[PDB]
Structure formats: structure tokens, C-alpha cells
Amino acid sequence: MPRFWEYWLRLMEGGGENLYFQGMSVPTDGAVTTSQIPASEQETLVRPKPLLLKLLKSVGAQKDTYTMKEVLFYLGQYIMTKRLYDEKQQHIVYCSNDLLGDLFGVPSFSVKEHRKIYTMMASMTGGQQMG
Template structure:
């Protein structure tokens, strides 16, 4: 399970940072999700959705919640992730429980708020239009 790197940083005065809201979404995870992200190595409390997905993948890998034979299966019963999801397991091929949890546990920030709190990172994923279509699944793309 490889992870996606999101380390392109720039100062807020740099013109490359002045992205439209469609290009850059910053989110603040609610406390239970933030604890999971921090357990996986996340620092701070403002992230992009891509970073949240990266740290969720790191958490699942670190805790070995995935099936070694069928790596698309995540068994999270008895774990804080399972409590947040409200399920014992899910497949990254059908990540609708994960997306539902993210919609409930991520607070979207305005671009102005995010510019003062977070380095600029370009991305193409938005909480509002997270797809449950397996063909358009950023979870699988991040964790592969």
C-alpha cells in the first residue's frame, strides 16, 4: 500500500497559493478523527482531504487493519476507526461508510482561514463531491 505525497508548500504571498476554492479545500477534523490522524503521524489540525486520506491509509497500515490476502478489505471492529465508521469492516472498493464518516467528521474551512493556518497544497478532491463510485475512488488511489 503506497501513499500519496502532498508536500508541495509555498508561502501565502506566492501567487501559486491563490487557488480557487475548487482547487484547494482545507478541512479541520473533529477530535475523534483527529486522534486517528495524529496516531498515524499527522501534525497540526488543518489538512487537505488528500492528507486526511493519506493518514487514514497510514493508520490502517500501521494498525494492520487490512486483510493481507485481500488488501481492499479493512477490518476495523474493536478499533476507534470502527467506532467512527459505525461498522466492523469495509472495502476500499465500496468506501461509502468511510465517505459518510468523513462528511460527519470534517469541517470545511474557508480559503481565507486556511491560508493563514496551513501551507498551500494543490488537490482535486472535495468533501462535498466525494464519489461513492468505485471507478472514481480516491481512497484506492491513495492507498495503492
């Protein structure tokens, strides 16, 4: 059986010492979301790029604004269904000349490089790169 999602879950159940040490600054306080029932799980909303929104909608995502955990959740389901992981190195994703490679700006990346994924994902929720 494959193990990609066991690695991807550690991004979402991650943070702390897994955060970046160069480039972007430490992310600001936010959320202020409800907790009136145990079903609550929500955090700060973001505006992901139209190129990423297409990928989220390829796995049936409903909204126009998203949480960082919602974007990662759906993106992990896309990588999972597309089988973009190496069959040997289950913790490494490969995608060139296709939508997920066009998003990440690299032919491949390690899922264990949580710090690098966090800064790349923070760039996807920034302004457009049409040029």
C-alpha cells in the first residue's frame, strides 16, 4: 500500500519547528473562528490563485475563499488521486509539464521539506504570476 498521505498529514498536523527560517517572516495572528460545538475546526481564510482554485475544483472544492488546512487537504487529495508520488520514495512528489508542477515551479519536491512547502504554499495565496 502507498504512504504519501501519511507524509502529507504531517504538513497539516505540523507547524512550530517545521516553519521556515529564511525568506518570508513568521505568519501573523488570526482565526477568531467559532467553537460553540465540537465539530468546529476552522481558521483564517485566504485567497488562493485561480490556477490553484482550478486544482481544488478538480477534486470538487465548493468555496471561493479557503483555510490553509483546506487548501493542503484538497491538494493532498489531488496528489493522491493523480499518483504523483514516487513508488519507491513515497515521501517525494513528481510533476513536470502539468498543473501541479506549474503551481509549485519545480519538477519535484520532498514532502518531508515542510519548511519549503510552507513558503511555496504561502506564495500560491499571494498575487498572480501570469508572465
